[PDB]
Structure formats: C-alpha cells, structure tokens
C-alpha cells in the first residue's frame, strides 16, 4: 500500500528510453515502485507529493546521468535524499552510474564544469557548496557502471534481484 523504493533521474535523456526498461521489469517482482514525471514549477518544493513520497520510500536508488548537474530541481532534491539518509541509516542508497565516469562525480569536474559555471550567478555562495558536499558522497557508494558495450538488458535483471533480495530475506 506504500512504496518500498523511489527513483530519480534526468527526464529528457533516460525517462522513456532506459529507466523505463527498469520500471516495468521491477513490477514483475510484484512490488510497488514509484516514478514521477511532473515538471514541478508549482512553487519550489512540494511537501504533499515529492517530500511525502521520500519519507514513505525505503531504498533510494538514484540514477546519475550525464546532465544530472543542470536541472535546478534534481540537485536540490538529491540533497534532500542523502541528508535524510544520514539521520537514520536504516535505509540505503544503490547509485547506478550511466554513460559517465565515476571520476566526474566526486569533484564536479569534466562535463559538469559548464553546469556550475553559470549556476553561481543566481543562488547563494553557501547553497552551492552544500550540493557539491552532498553530490560527492554519492560517488563513493557501491554501483554498477554501465559500459557503452554492457547489455542494457542483463544489468536490469541482475540489479532487480539485488533489490528483491533485500526484501524477501528482510
Ligand atoms: N523539469 C524537469 N527536468 C528534469 N527532471 C525533472 C523535471 N521535473 C521533474 N523531474 C524529475 O522527476 C522526478 C520525480 O521523482 C525527480 O527526480 P529527480 O532526480 O530529482 O528529478 C525529478
């Protein structure tokens, strides 16, 4: 009746192409998986929808993308994930790097340079340091890298069982 999982990704790149192959596949394990596409813009943060679903979720599984550093909504939401995680470590995080090195995620360099080059002209000089402090930790947790040659299929099947293993054995 509630959500045992919660996703997060970049809509223009993998929302209908790659992430989708995971969601349908996951529902075949008979579990409620939550995914949203609402472009928000109704304020700056919605307590009834995004904030509630987060505290209802159990296994936060973001999916870092190449452009995971441009959307003004994604990062501020990611900061709300890992921050809530550090209070109660009963839950976990299983990131999945995708078509990006596991080196341009701990230092915001590489193909993120242009992203924070322009984001520094509008927001605070401390809020940005908060994101880079939060985004760094995600790039230290365990994660399946997806090589340009890796089967988009089998990776989905294997990563599903590891999610389903933590539920059946509890
Ligand atoms: N305009 C948008 N551009 C990109 N992603 C969006 C947009 N609006 C919403 N999202 C994403 O919808 C997801 C719902 O859980 C949420 O996960 P996220 O990674 O924080 O990016 C958000």
Sign of the four-CA dihedral 6, 9, 15, 19: negative
- Does residue 9's CB lie within 6 angstroms of at least one atom of ligand 1? yes
- Does residue 40's CB lie within 6 angstroms of at least one atom of ligand 1? yes
Contact assessment for residue 153 and residue 21, using Cβ atoms and an 8 Å cutoff: yes
What span, in angstroms and rounded, lies between the C-alpha atoms of 161 and 21?
Answer: 15
> Which atom of ligand 1 is nearest the CA belonging to 78?
20
Into how many domains does the chain fold?
1
This PDB structure is determined at a resolution in Å of: 3.0
- In this structure, the number of other CB atoms found within 10 A of the CB of residue 68 comes to 24
Q: What's the Cα-to-Cα distance from 64 to each of 32, 55, 154, 170, rounded to whole Å? A: 22, 21, 19, 27
Tokens 């939060």, residue located: 134
**φ, ψ for residue 6, nearest 5 deg:** -165, 125
> Which atom of ligand 1 is nearest the CA belonging to 9?
19
71 lies in which domain range? 1-170
User: Can you state the percent helix, strand and coil of the chain, rounding each to 5?
Assistant: 45, 5, 50
Length of the chain in residues, anyone?
A: 170
Using the 8-state DSSP alphabet, how is residue 137 labeled? H
What span, in angstroms and rounded, lies between the C-alpha atoms of 34 and 57?
Answer: 8
What span, in angstroms and rounded, lies between the C-alpha atoms of 71 and 14?
Answer: 14
What span, in angstroms and rounded, lies between the C-alpha atoms of 82 and 136?
Answer: 10
- Does residue 4's CB lie within 6 angstroms of at least one atom of ligand 1? no
> Which atom of ligand 1 is nearest the CA belonging to 6?
15
Beta bridge partners of 60: 6, 93
Sign of the four-CA dihedral 67, 119, 131, 112: positive
Beta bridge partners of 93: 60
| Structural tokens at position 132 | 């880079």
Contact assessment for residue 12 and residue 74, using Cβ atoms and an 8 Å cutoff: no
Protein residue closest via CA to atom 12 of ligand 1: 37
């Amino acid at each position: 009746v509630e959500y045992d999982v919660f996703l997060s990704f970049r809509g223009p790149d993998t929302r209908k192409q790659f992430t989708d192959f995971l969601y349908h596949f996951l529902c075949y394990y008979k579990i409620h998986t939550f995914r949203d596409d609402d472009e928000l813009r109704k304020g700056k943060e919605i307590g009834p929808n995004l904030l509630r679903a987060i505290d209802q979720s159990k296994i936060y599984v973001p999916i870092i993308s190449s452009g995971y550093a441009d959307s003004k909504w994604c990062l501020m939401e990611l900061a709300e994930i890992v921050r809530r995680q550090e209070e109660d470590p009963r839950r976990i995080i299983l990131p999945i790097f995708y078509m990006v090195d596991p080196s341009d995620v701990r230092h915001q360099t590489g193909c993120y340079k242009k992203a924070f080059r322009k984001h520094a002209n509008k927001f605070d000089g401390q809020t940005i340091q908060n994101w880079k402090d939060a985004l760094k930790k995600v790039g230290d947790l365990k994660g399946w890298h997806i090589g340009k040659d890796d089967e988009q299929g089998a990776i989905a099947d294997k990563v599903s069982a590891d999610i389903w293993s933590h539920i059946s054995k509890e």
